[PDB]
Write a protein that binds this ligand. Structure first.
Ligand code: NA
Ligand code: NA
Lengths: 223, 223
């Protein structure tokens, strides 16, 4: 596809940007931090970034959000990252999952927050996605936990929403904001339309991606 | 300013992206091509990019558009680029102006188009700006030459518009599209609002930046 070529090329340019963001941090600090998002859109970005000759041993990688499922579950964000990003040179990166062996996120969240606080914040880069409903990470407009996620200084927050089929853990808005580079990576026309509506207003509860659109951000979009 | 810091940091990340885009091209081709825009917004991006250790001798630099004024005129885009981008390592780049010594752009445009056609298209990167009226390059919604600029295969087109005080030369939309990376670099709330409206519709004549929003593009914005 000319569509597929455009998305591939966009992802390669994004991988350049992120690799350089990491190198710039690694020139000043012992360790650097990369926060990524799941879904299908990041795949070519992960593959391109994974192949970069970078001091990956000094890079910590974690997720913007996660589903409360095992690491080998089809719906696991960690699985996608392991299979796509942590290969070749990037296999030397240290990945930090957002789960524990507790059967509920409520039981595991303190342990996860504790683990996140130990990483080298501010992140060199935070790579976000956006859903058709304007959500980002696991900040959902229909979640009763959204207000807490948008306001707390805690690193991670448990999230439930009628519109998603499993329980979630999200990094808080405050935590996700603590980065030198933010990227929103989205493709397709519907997401262009929703982003337009997001940019046009300021009510974060309505379209949570707005929490990041009022601060410096690079949006990478392709048809 | 925290505002100024945000814009500076955004520009540094953009400079990384553009430098890597150029290096990627230079790994495959003898010469690379960078197309930049004028105005105040690009300044910190030019300064950051200028300092990069890159094979600048193999890079051709030109403009997205230009005012029909001398190279030392306060309103010259070429002057801004020379004073800000073409310094230090980047002083070895070969700059290609969009003017001639003819007293009208109508008389000079063939010569300028001829000069542009000799450059290493597709560009490694095209860096665009956007005005409060939704214009980009010198593609103005109130110009009687807009339709020609949007449709012609000619490299450059003469442009007049009641809303700007001097005659212009713009690269055509077709020419500006011929690049592996497009960036829209904008700052401030008014431009966020106009971009939102641009993204929400498809009428290019109304908001000419729309000509580039339907293809892969990275938007770099800061408050
Ligand atoms: Na649910
Ligand atoms: Na005029």
């Amino acid at each position: 596809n000319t569509t597929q070529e455009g998305r591939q090329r966009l992802a390669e340019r994004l991988a350049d940007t992120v690799a350089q963001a990491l190198e710039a941090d690694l020139a000043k600090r012992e360790r650097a931090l990369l926060v990524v998002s799941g879904g299908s859109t990041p795949k070519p970005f992960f593959t391109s970034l994974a192949a970069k000759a970078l001091p990956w041993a000094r890079v910590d990688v974690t997720l913007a959000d996660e589903r409360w499922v095992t690491a080998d579950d089809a719906d696991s964000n960690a699985r996608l990252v392991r299979e796509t990003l942590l290969v070749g040179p990037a296999a030397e990166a240290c990945f930090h999952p957002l789960t524990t062996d507790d059967d509920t996120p409520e039981a595991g969240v303190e342990t996860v927050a504790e683990r996140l606080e130990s990483l080298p914040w501010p992140a060199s880069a935070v790579i976000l996605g956006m859903g058709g409903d304007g959500h980002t990470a696991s900040l959902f407009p229909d979640s009763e936990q959204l207000a807490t996620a948008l306001e707390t200084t805690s690193a991670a927050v448990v999230v439930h929403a009628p519109s998603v089929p499993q329980a979630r853990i999200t990094l808080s808005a405050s935590r996700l904001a603590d980065a030198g580079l933010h990227v929103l990576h989205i493709t397709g026309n519907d997401k262009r339309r929703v982003l337009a509506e997001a940019l046009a207003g300021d009510d974060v509860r309505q379209l949570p991606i707005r929490a990041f659109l009022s601060q410096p951000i690079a949006t990478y979009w392709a048809p």
